[PDB]
Amino acid sequence: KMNPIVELFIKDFTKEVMEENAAIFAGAGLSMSVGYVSWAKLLEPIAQEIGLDVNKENDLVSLAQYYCNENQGNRGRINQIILDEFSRKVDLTENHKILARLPIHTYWTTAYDRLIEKALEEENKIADVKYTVKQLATTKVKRDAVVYKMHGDVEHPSEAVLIKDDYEKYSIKMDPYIKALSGDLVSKTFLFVGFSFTDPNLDYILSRVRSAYERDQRRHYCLIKKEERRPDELEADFEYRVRKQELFISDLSRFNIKTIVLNNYNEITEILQRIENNIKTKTVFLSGSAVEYNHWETEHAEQFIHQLSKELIRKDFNIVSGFGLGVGSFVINGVLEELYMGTIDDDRLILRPFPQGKKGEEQWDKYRRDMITRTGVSIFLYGNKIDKGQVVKAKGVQSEFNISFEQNNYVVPVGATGYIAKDLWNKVNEEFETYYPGADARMKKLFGELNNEALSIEELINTIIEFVEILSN
Amino acid sequence: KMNPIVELFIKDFTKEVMEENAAIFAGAGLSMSVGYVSWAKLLEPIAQEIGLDVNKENDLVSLAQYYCNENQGNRGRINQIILDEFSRKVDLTENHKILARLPIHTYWTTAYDRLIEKALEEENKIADVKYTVKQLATTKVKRDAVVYKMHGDVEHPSEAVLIKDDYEKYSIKMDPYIKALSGDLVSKTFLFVGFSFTDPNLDYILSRVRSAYERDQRRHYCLIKKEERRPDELEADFEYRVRKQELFISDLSRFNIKTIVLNNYNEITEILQRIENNIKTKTVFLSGSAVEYNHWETEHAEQFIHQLSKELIRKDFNIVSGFGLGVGSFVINGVLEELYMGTIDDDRLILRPFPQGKKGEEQWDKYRRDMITRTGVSIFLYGNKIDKGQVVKAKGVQSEFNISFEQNNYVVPVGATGYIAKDLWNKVNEEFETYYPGADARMKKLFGELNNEALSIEELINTIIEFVEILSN
Amino acid sequence: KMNPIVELFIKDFTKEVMEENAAIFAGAGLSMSVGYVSWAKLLEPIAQEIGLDVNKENDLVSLAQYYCNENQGNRGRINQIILDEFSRKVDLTENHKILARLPIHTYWTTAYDRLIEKALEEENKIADVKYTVKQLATTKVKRDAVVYKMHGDVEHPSEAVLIKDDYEKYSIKMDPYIKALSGDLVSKTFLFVGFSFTDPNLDYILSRVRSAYERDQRRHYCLIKKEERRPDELEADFEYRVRKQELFISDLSRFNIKTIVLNNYNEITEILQRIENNIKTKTVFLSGSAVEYNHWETEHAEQFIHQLSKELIRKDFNIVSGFGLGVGSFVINGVLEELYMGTIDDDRLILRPFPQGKKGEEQWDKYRRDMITRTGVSIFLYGNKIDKGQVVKAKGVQSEFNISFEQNNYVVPVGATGYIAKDLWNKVNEEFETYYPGADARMKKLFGELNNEALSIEELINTIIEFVEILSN
Numbered sequence A, B, C: 001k002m003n004p005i006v007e008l009f010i011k012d013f014t015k016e017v018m019e020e021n022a023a024i025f026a027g028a029g030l031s032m033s034v035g036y037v038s039w040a041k042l043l044e045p046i047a048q049e050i051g052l053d054v055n056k057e058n059d060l061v062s063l064a065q066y067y068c069n070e071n072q073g074n075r076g077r078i079n080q081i082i083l084d085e086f087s088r089k090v091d092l093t094e095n096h097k098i099l100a101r102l103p104i105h106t107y108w109t110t111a112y113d114r115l116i117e118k119a120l121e122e123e124n125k126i127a128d129v130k131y132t133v134k135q136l137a138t139t140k141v142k143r144d145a146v147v148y149k150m151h152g153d154v155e156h157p158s159e160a161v162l163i164k165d166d167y168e169k170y171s172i173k174m175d176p177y178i179k180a181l182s183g184d185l186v187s188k189t190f191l192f193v194g195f196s197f198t199d200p201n202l203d204y205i206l207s208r209v210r211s212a213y214e215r216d217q218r219r220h221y222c223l224i225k226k227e228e229r230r231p232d233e234l235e236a237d238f239e240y241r242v243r244k245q246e247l248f249i250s251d252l253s254r255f256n257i258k259t260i261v262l263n264n265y266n267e268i269t270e271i272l273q274r275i276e277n278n279i280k281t282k283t284v285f286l287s288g289s290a291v292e293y294n295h296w297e298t299e300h301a302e303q304f305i306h307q308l309s310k311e312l313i314r315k316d317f318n319i320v321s322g323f324g325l326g327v328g329s330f331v332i333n334g335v336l337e338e339l340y341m342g343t344i345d346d347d348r349l350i351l352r353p354f355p356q357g358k359k360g361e362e363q364w365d366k367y368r369r370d371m372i373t374r375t376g377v378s379i380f381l382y383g384n385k386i387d388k389g390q391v392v393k394a395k396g397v398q399s400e401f402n403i404s405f406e407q408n409n410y411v412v413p414v415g416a417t418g419y420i421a422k423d424l425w426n427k428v429n430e431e432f433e434t435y436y437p438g439a440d441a442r443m444k445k446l447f448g449e450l451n452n453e454a455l456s457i458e459e460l461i462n463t464i465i466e467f468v469e470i471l472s473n
């Protein structure tokens, strides 16, 4: 768990992303942990040529402009520097991979590198990268996300926004990008990551949006790390910097941009992981097959499964089922009862009955893996089939459990149902920290209660629902 | 083996590439086997909109120009078509991978797709892709090859050369690319693959180079498939098409471009594989360790190894040795005698002595794999070490043989030397077709003679040299 | 040390040359210190024949054109003059030898003499000299550099560009050379040495490149000597000449050519020597053999050597080692740890194990000399072997030190390691000015600290690294 402000932000932004109305605004700071050297370090020889010192300079745009002025406006050196630096092959950080995995269809970047594009490519996602006005007129077919590189691309250094001339002519040359960013800011919920909010173009666009929409501006989010006490600095200077940062945050609020203050930069990764988990765990994989329903009678167990599926649908969960013999019909009935109040939404219930025959069993493993990949939580019930007239614990449920563990999915074996479910519950309780690291007391109590045969249908269903909810929320 | 013309071309172009003075000119036809639909198929709705038929049209540039004329010069539809088609994700063909593996530093492409770029990326090579005049002013650091997309990129459809207006303004807008291609044509040996030589820009550039250099033009190569009898066509029409193609190839030779006529398009892959094999097999991995030199005396075996290494250096082979105990010193002496006639060129002899100690043995496997990867032919001699005062057949030579086989390197175990070399020779002779598929009678005779103890030093060395040469050449 | 502008230029141009993307543009002024009489002195009788005075004339091209006009366009006299003058045998200056020693593959010359060609020949380098349009169509095999004599050769006086007619017909006759120079100016980093930038052809080419590339021109460098007060001139005239030169330099920046102002012409030699030293010292020769590691334990010394080699690789140094007994394995391990993060680049680590036996010891001396020649800095560690069961200071390390001194390589004996290293450190400290003339206080302090046994592994390694870096950088 994190700070209550962080928890509220995680809930709200997960809600925004699940509606596919969220955009990510990534600054250069998101790529500073990857391995690219700092822009000030690159400009250090540039500053030394014109007789300045990059460490004593804070406005690097004016520094680059001064260098260009000292060379009759020529940018060849800076173009070569940025091409040499930001085109290097660097391993992607975890933040880029998580952002690629999230269902985010809009990225706006002020960085010249192609880390977002590579992260989207490695997720088998089609990325429509735009850094030219002409490129706005063409859309890639079946694209997953669109990346607006509003400061240019690394492979086109001459069109990168680096000097004051570029910022001054941006409002004329790149006006369609300004219009697009204004439309996204008024129509989408943005998350600013790695952005210092010192960009003149972004200040201009935000001021225009504020002038247009007054107090009815859309709420956006930013992630900013708190000020850290430098070794040379004194306590008074640190407190002054903290107060300055606080005033900087209220000003951003003037643009209806709420700032989340983070202790360190790894909290960005933690927040992204939490959002990804909240999105992924909303889909539950219901598994099991039952000819004999352990201690419970047939009708009682059927009603239990029906009401469990109805509660899962009611709690805004998407059920994926393999249509196991003896369990599939009743989860289908529960979903139908919950939804027919109507049509079967494709997202709420995904049914994947296994092909029957010799041909089906060849691809059964890939079918099972594809079915499980859609989910983030696996729920196992019973696990008994009939082979030679006798009830024998099933083997498909064990394969499902193995696939779920290999995909880092949460496993919720209900031991009260018995058979392979009870075996899996015993296995999980044998090594609880391996499957649920850092579990709370309530989580342990719910997991232990999952193997209670004295619970009624309602009590067991409520225990399962609460366990799945604390896993997801 | 292929046609004598093809063999002469393979020898000459391998010679050109090994000097790193060869360039590849790839047309759109090189990407027509990957999965991209034909440009005529894309223009079929375009032709139907202006009332024409793309099947009845041969000049598609004029067709696109007519379509643009019917729409007040607007190219949005064609830009969208090319962006949708040529930006799709398609698996690379073998030709692109072989070309990426070859030491070719210059590519000139008339195709908009990024197949060459992806092939170079998958080989861990830095590719400097150029399709804008500005991009010519910046060079990537430590780049392996430069790709000039002279007709534009797929991600920038508006700048693609498709219509007659683009060809008519190319000489003004893209003049630096014309100058660069002229310089490459006069300074590098080109191989035209997938090019139909119907491009007005290439005709203009070739005519300018011819006018500048008269009969002293640099020779270039092209690969063209012979005409095939269409099912509907008659014999007379097929013969007329063959004569027309012959006249086309002879006019092509007016520009000092020799054409290799191929029966089918897989012969392009065969030629590329042959060139890659000729380049790769010129580096021989000399392996072995010997305390007791089988039947031969110590001095006799040392002289044999020395003269074998001297002959390998004399036959233009690059020796890579692991400095095995008892074999390394004498191959070093042979290389020194062959070269000191002088300094040790880094390419001719690469020495990789194994680190000694517990720390070295941890990375010994990766060291061995990296050492073997540099070579294409593995030669094994003896293979006996001393462990507890007795001569025991070594185990490192077996690992080297396994790595060589896993890398598809040719293995030449000399059974006359005995020990692990004799064991490897017996293993190879056990399954000869697995290691040398489609071997000739001379190759089998040489392999059998490799295990003859009655041969002298000169005879055995000549047998080894001839076997390695027929493997390489 | 030189001016900070000169230091920045040296760093940037060393970086450019080490990437093998640097070209040298040599004017006639680079050959005016060799012994050739001035062109005005040669034209003095030519000027007197048409009634003019060469001292009162500044445009010698127009003077030669007037002379040709007075003789019906005949150039026999001027051809004879240039053939007699510039074909004389003159000893090469230091600048030509340094430029030949540098890894520069492209020279462009406006001088008719063959000094660059002779300097490249005396370095055992293959030079491909081009002064005819036809010669551009043929490339020498295994050439080290290509020399474009764009104003003609001395042995072909009739084709030398001397008169206004030659300059006026250059754009038509020598158009391929114009295209080649434009391509080099846009693809390579040029250094202009001895060039006055008053050549109409170079002005035309630079204007065309500027018109083509606007502010995205590649940065180039020029070396220009500052104006000197003539004995007859007054202070006001000298200041006017200084201002005129400043305006001239600022107008070459219009072409993105940065000018380095030098006090005298020997600073060209100093800059070239500094660049050569920076390139040469980046390769360090690691020497030593150790059975007993002085005061330090075996494992401690092994870890020290491993981390020292890892730091050397990390600091962009290329290690050349003779694989000495007890030192070679651990430097190999350090290089492998630094690089496997991967394959062993041939440049980063060159391993030269000595051949073992009577045959190897015959060529051991030449092998050692060839191994050391690749480096510019020699680092000596320990130097103790075992001969008759007792630790005896080695003799190969002494030979290595002697060879390093004979090649003017920097020697860094680490006295803390003891044995021959300590003896060499004592010898160097005995005559410090002989080995390190003009050493700073920091260099002396580091050299003294090199013989401190109280330093830890990290402290000693940092001292060695800092000493080697101040030697190189």
Ligand SMILES: O=P1(O)OC[C@H]2O[C@@H](O[C@H]3[C@@H](O)[C@H](n4cnc5c4ncn4ccnc54)O[C@@H]3COP(=O)(O)O1)[C@H](O)[C@@H]2O
Binding pocket: A286, A287, A288, A289, A321, A322, A323, A324, A325, A326, A354, A383, A384, A385, A394, A395, A396, A397, A400
């Ligand atoms: O019980 P298990 O071991 O694992 C149970 C899991 O598997 C999947 O459902 C089973 C099974 O109910 C279904 N099935 C239905 N009718 C027959 C049948 N299979 C073989 N038959 C032979 C004759 N009639 C049948 O076929 C799936 C594959 O078979 P298994 O994986 O071996 O089944 C669910 O997702 C369930 O979670």
Ligand SMILES: O=P1(O)OC[C@H]2O[C@@H](O[C@H]3[C@@H](O)[C@H](n4cnc5c4ncn4ccnc54)O[C@@H]3COP(=O)(O)O1)[C@H](O)[C@@H]2O
Binding pocket: B286, B287, B288, B289, B321, B322, B323, B324, B325, B326, B354, B383, B384, B385, B394, B395, B396, B397, B400
């Ligand atoms: O003979 P093999 O099985 O394989 C032979 C192949 O290996 C490599 O050279 C060997 C070996 O000559 C060398 N080596 C030298 N001196 C010693 C030593 N190894 C262990 N020692 C213990 C005491 N003294 C030594 O260490 C390499 C690794 O050892 P192995 O691979 O086990 O050696 C070549 O490339 C050779 O082709």
Ligand SMILES: O=P1(O)OC[C@H]2O[C@@H](O[C@H]3[C@@H](O)[C@H](n4cnc5c4ncn4ccnc54)O[C@@H]3COP(=O)(O)O1)[C@H](O)[C@@H]2O
Binding pocket: C286, C287, C288, C289, C321, C322, C323, C324, C325, C326, C354, C383, C384, C385, C394, C395, C396, C397, C400
């Ligand atoms: O130590 P030093 O005087 O100089 C040390 C320098 O020389 C070179 O490495 C030595 C030495 O480690 C190596 N070597 C390994 N094993 C044996 C052997 N030499 C004779 N043997 C007899 C029996 N076993 C050996 O042979 C090189 C030549 O021998 P020397 O130059 O006389 O060796 C490095 O570059 C080192 O810097």
